[PDB]
């Protein structure tokens, strides 16, 4: 319902949901987990998992 003159593209889009989704996936997903750094081989076998 907003007008082209009444609203600007920067004021229409809310970027909060995409940032929240990216943060949630990168911090709380099952596949996101702390790297095994006790061995250099542990890192390689974790990233190739």
């Amino acid at each position: 319902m907003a007008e082209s003159e009444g609203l600007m593209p920067q004021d229409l889009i809310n970027a909060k949901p995409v940032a929240a989704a990216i943060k949630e996936f990168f911090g709380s997903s099952q596949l996101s987990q702390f790297m095994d750094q006790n061995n250099p081989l542990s890192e390689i076998t974790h990233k190739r998992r």
Binding site: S4, A15, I22, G27, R48
Partner: protein, 144 residues
């Protein structure tokens, strides 16, 4: 004959030839993320999967009973705010800003090119991508 091996030679019992050298071990992760990011953009960025693919997937937006659309232009990745070592020291998630150019084009709903008002500008900072490090991992809140 390289310099590093000149320090110590392993006696190898290989009785079969090395037709192909062992490929890079972490390529399966580094290839995926760099294809997902599409850092190298030509005049026409690759139509393959990635953030660009998702943006084109949600490209045409039609207002409900209205003549107004949001066309997407190529996005522009930001520059890393911190170095990865600095992020590990501080906990800055080693993120890079994301911004895209969108055009809000309204019409007169006359089934043609009427009421020509195309407002194209770079959109707001749509979050920040964690920008995987060169070793196949990335820092989130200071932890690898």
């Amino acid at each position: 004959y390289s310099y590093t091996e000149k320090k110590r030679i392993r006696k190898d019992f290989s009785k079969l030839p090395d037709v192909m050298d062992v490929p890079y071990l972490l390529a399966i992760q580094l290839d995926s993320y760099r294809e997902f990011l599409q850092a190298g953009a030509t005049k026409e960025q690759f139509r393959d999967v990635g953030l660009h693919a998702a943006f084109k997937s949600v490209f045409p937006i039609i207002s409900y009973s209205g003549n107004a659309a949001l066309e997407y232009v190529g996005y522009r990745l930001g520059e890393p705010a911190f170095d990865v070592k600095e992020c590990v020291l501080r906990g800055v998630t080693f993120a890079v800003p994301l911004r895209v150019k969108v055009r809000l084009i309204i019409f007169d709903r006359e089934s043609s090119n009427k009421a020509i008002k195309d407002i194209k500008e770079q959109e707001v900072y749509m979050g920040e991508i964690p920008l995987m490090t060169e070793n196949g991992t990335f820092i989130i809140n200071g932890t690898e």
